[PDB]
Ligand binder design. Structure first.
Ligand SMILES: NC(=[NH2+])c1ccsc1
Lengths: 352, 13
């Protein structure tokens, strides 16, 4: 076979340890999922700088006045969160983040709300977004991309074992920490799902075809998105690339993908099996589950346990000038935080 | 030709 006796026995034992780990991880998750609120207030923090902005608010660097610790504070304008699925999704985000625990998932520290806004305060990751490093360097070498991909594979294996689908994988959502490892943030589209779910949501370049086609879909959409991420990391641009979303969607559904001439044959084989329109054939969705990915030739040099334990030397260590350094983030327009005299949307966000 | 800047996710397409 491809493996000798010693190699196959070790791998089998390793897979059984994974099952042992995931069983314990689920027990700890469920305890927090059933018993999740209001762990601080706005005036406990000094606002420093806006680190990112999107439709419904911003992420800011803040400094905790009492302890001097720095945090990333996400601010959601309760009114701007007006759309039906915008609302449910915000409750998903907070409840998932307060219950998970994994070395590549950002840690939530406080959450609270006032008359105008919802707030989630999490660990500050000063190395910046993968997105900006990727655009600056152009593309990552295959060993470099592989190091990051392995972390996503393990993170999705963890999430999916808890019946969580992530649904918004992309470089914009992946922060680089001081050791060069990944921190997945932005759980705004994550959802606990026992079978299928139906919401049309995500980022166009990363949408699986079954989402675009309005099918009930499952966790396999995350393995498709992994294929898009690996391609983008190794090429510098995503596989389905056009100016307007409708053109992106047509390319996604076609069942066609072209690869740069510098892609290794091992990489193309992996990506063909991840970017597979047929769900009966997509890696991660077969009888052997995630092991079809972990045991792929392109990952043959990957020490899965060593990645999880953070024993592998990272390919890139971001520059850090000290606590509160924002040099690895882009600049954004600053807008003061105005809190209304009157509560908005009190009933909608009772559970937050 | 495609989008090179940060990409916003859509909550309800
Ligand atoms: N949550 C994010 N995407 C983010 C971006 C810059 S700092 C945090």
């Amino acid at each position: 076979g491809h493996m000798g006796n010693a190699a196959a026995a070790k791998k089998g034992s390793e897979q059984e340890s994974v099952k042992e780990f995931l069983a314990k991880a689920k027990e700890e998750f469920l305890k927090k999922w059933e018993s999740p609120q209001n762990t601080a207030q706005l005036d406990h923090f000094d606002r420093i700088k806006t680190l990112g902005t999107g439709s419904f608010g911003r992420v800011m660097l803040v400094k905790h006045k009492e302890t001097g610790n720095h945090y990333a504070m996400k601010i959601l304008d309760k009114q701007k969160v007006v759309k039906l699925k915008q609302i449910e999704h915000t409750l998903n985000e907070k409840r998932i983040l307060q219950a998970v625990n994994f070395p590549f998932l950002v840690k939530l520290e406080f959450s609270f709300k006032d008359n105008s806004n919802l707030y989630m305060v999490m660990e500050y990751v000063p190395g910046g977004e993968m997105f900006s490093h990727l655009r600056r360097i152009g593309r990552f070498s295959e060993p470099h991309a592989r190091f990051y991909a392995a972390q996503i594979v393990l993170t999705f294996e963890y999430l999916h074992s808890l019946d969580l689908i992530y649904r918004d994988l992309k470089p914009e959502n992946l922060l680089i920490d001081q050791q060069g490892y990944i921190q997945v943030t932005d759980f705004g589209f994550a959802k606990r799902v026992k079978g299928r779910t139906w919401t049309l949501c995500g980022t166009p370049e990363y949408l699986a075809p079954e989402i675009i086609l309005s099918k009930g879909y499952n966790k396999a959409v995350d393995w498709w998105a992994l294929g898009v991420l690996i391609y983008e990391m190794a090429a510098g641009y995503p596989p389905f690339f056009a100016d307007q979303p409708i053109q992106i969607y047509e390319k996604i559904v076609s069942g066609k993908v072209r690869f740069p001439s510098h892609f290794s044959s091992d990489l193309k084989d992996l990506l063909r099996n991840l970017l597979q329109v047929d769900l009966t054939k997509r890696f991660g969705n077969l009888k052997n589950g995630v092991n079809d990915i972990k045991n792929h030739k392109w990952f043959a040099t990957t020490d899965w346990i060593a990645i999880y334990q953070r024993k592998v030397e990272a390919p890139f260590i971001p520059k850090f000038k000290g606590p509160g350094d924002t040099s690895n983030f882009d600049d954004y327009e600053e807008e003061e935080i105005r809190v209304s005299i009157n509560e908005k949307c009190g009933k909608e966000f009772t559970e937050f | 030709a495609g989008r090179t800047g940060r990409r916003q996710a859509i909550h309800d397409i």
